Design a protein around this motif. Sequence first.
Motif, PDB file in Angstrom:
ATOM      1  N   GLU A   6      11.533  14.942  -6.072  1.00 27.79           N
ATOM      2  CA  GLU A   6      11.072  16.318  -6.318  1.00 27.79           C
ATOM      3  C   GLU A   6       9.607  16.535  -5.920  1.00 27.79           C
ATOM      4  O   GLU A   6       9.265  17.556  -5.320  1.00 27.79           O
ATOM      5  CB  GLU A   6      11.201  16.619  -7.814  1.00 27.79           C
ATOM      6  CG  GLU A   6      12.609  16.407  -8.401  1.00 27.79           C
ATOM      7  CD  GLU A   6      12.633  16.724  -9.895  1.00 27.79           C
ATOM      8  OE1 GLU A   6      12.414  17.883 -10.252  1.00 27.79           O
ATOM      9  OE2 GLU A   6      12.886  15.821 -10.693  1.00 27.79           O
ATOM     10  N   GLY A   7       8.734  15.594  -6.257  1.00 23.87           N
ATOM     11  CA  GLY A   7       7.285  15.738  -5.981  1.00 23.87           C
ATOM     12  C   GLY A   7       6.936  15.616  -4.499  1.00 23.87           C
ATOM     13  O   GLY A   7       6.163  16.398  -3.931  1.00 23.87           O
ATOM     14  N   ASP A   8       7.517  14.600  -3.890  1.00 24.58           N
ATOM     15  CA  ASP A   8       7.274  14.374  -2.477  1.00 24.58           C
ATOM     16  C   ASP A   8       7.916  15.440  -1.567  1.00 24.58           C
ATOM     17  O   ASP A   8       7.463  15.565  -0.432  1.00 24.58           O
ATOM     18  CB  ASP A   8       7.623  12.922  -2.044  1.00 24.58           C
ATOM     19  CG  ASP A   8       8.811  12.255  -2.722  1.00 24.58           C
ATOM     20  OD1 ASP A   8       9.923  12.397  -2.223  1.00 24.58           O
ATOM     21  OD2 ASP A   8       8.607  11.568  -3.723  1.00 24.58           O
ATOM     22  N   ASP A   9       8.933  16.215  -1.950  1.00 27.18           N
ATOM     23  CA  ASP A   9       9.478  17.281  -0.996  1.00 27.18           C
ATOM     24  C   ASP A   9       8.429  18.298  -0.465  1.00 27.18           C
ATOM     25  O   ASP A   9       8.293  18.551   0.737  1.00 27.18           O
ATOM     26  CB  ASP A   9      10.729  17.990  -1.659  1.00 27.18           C
ATOM     27  CG  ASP A   9      12.114  17.318  -1.583  1.00 27.18           C
ATOM     28  OD1 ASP A   9      12.565  17.002  -0.485  1.00 27.18           O
ATOM     29  OD2 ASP A   9      12.759  17.134  -2.616  1.00 27.18           O
ATOM     30  N   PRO A  10       7.622  18.935  -1.320  1.00 27.50           N
ATOM     31  CA  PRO A  10       6.574  19.915  -0.886  1.00 27.50           C
ATOM     32  C   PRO A  10       5.556  19.259   0.037  1.00 27.50           C
ATOM     33  O   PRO A  10       5.032  19.888   0.963  1.00 27.50           O
ATOM     34  CB  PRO A  10       5.852  20.392  -2.140  1.00 27.50           C
ATOM     35  CG  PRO A  10       6.530  19.722  -3.328  1.00 27.50           C
ATOM     36  CD  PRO A  10       7.637  18.830  -2.794  1.00 27.50           C
ATOM     37  N   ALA A  11       5.325  17.993  -0.269  1.00 27.32           N
ATOM     38  CA  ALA A  11       4.427  17.160   0.514  1.00 27.32           C
ATOM     39  C   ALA A  11       4.997  16.900   1.906  1.00 27.32           C
ATOM     40  O   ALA A  11       4.256  16.926   2.891  1.00 27.32           O
ATOM     41  CB  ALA A  11       4.249  15.837  -0.196  1.00 27.32           C
ATOM     42  N   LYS A  12       6.296  16.639   1.971  1.00 25.31           N
ATOM     43  CA  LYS A  12       6.969  16.365   3.257  1.00 25.31           C
ATOM     44  C   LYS A  12       6.858  17.576   4.183  1.00 25.31           C
ATOM     45  O   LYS A  12       6.581  17.453   5.381  1.00 25.31           O
ATOM     46  CB  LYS A  12       8.457  16.024   3.044  1.00 25.31           C
ATOM     47  CG  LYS A  12       8.745  14.573   2.635  1.00 25.31           C
ATOM     48  CD  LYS A  12      10.240  14.277   2.380  1.00 25.31           C
ATOM     49  CE  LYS A  12      11.101  14.294   3.655  1.00 25.31           C
ATOM     50  NZ  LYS A  12      12.506  13.925   3.384  1.00 25.31           N
ATOM     51  N   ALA A  13       7.077  18.742   3.601  1.00 27.61           N
ATOM     52  CA  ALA A  13       7.008  20.009   4.354  1.00 27.61           C
ATOM     53  C   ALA A  13       5.582  20.292   4.819  1.00 27.61           C
ATOM     54  O   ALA A  13       5.346  20.769   5.933  1.00 27.61           O
ATOM     55  CB  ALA A  13       7.477  21.155   3.451  1.00 27.61           C
ATOM     56  N   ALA A  14       4.650  19.985   3.935  1.00 27.47           N
ATOM     57  CA  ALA A  14       3.229  20.209   4.228  1.00 27.47           C
ATOM     58  C   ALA A  14       2.837  19.384   5.445  1.00 27.47           C
ATOM     59  O   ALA A  14       2.091  19.842   6.314  1.00 27.47           O
ATOM     60  CB  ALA A  14       2.389  19.767   3.034  1.00 27.47           C
ATOM     61  N   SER A  73       4.116  20.829   8.680  1.00 25.50           N
ATOM     62  CA  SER A  73       3.213  21.928   9.077  1.00 25.50           C
ATOM     63  C   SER A  73       1.977  21.383   9.778  1.00 25.50           C
ATOM     64  O   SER A  73       1.537  21.904  10.806  1.00 25.50           O
ATOM     65  CB  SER A  73       2.736  22.679   7.834  1.00 25.50           C
ATOM     66  OG  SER A  73       3.855  23.173   7.117  1.00 25.50           O
TER      67      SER A  73
END
Lengths: 50, 50
Positions: A2-10, A13
């Motif tokens: 859950e935590g690393d998903d937003p990071a992966k997308a970032a 980008s």
Amino acid sequence: AEGDDPAKAAFDSLQASATEYIGYAWAMVVVIVGATIGIKLFKKFTSKAS
Amino acid sequence: AEGDDPAKAAFDSLQASATEYIGYAWAMVVVIVGATIGIKLFKKFTSKAS
């Protein structure tokens, strides 16, 4: 998970951004090299005269 | 003998409870450490770029 998903997308980008900067590098060198081809051509003419 | 038996059991209960709290501690730190691994990973990327 859950935590690393937003990071992966970032990171996706950031990588794309990196791709833009890179395109600009390619162009810059396009100008520099255009310059080298033409000037080297002038020298070529010097040779023809010689 | 007789007096300390209820006490012994009470202590068993308390110890188990303690085990639950402890499981939660392990998880909490799971999140904190997950955070440290990912962020430290971002720094790692900074290095790759450098």
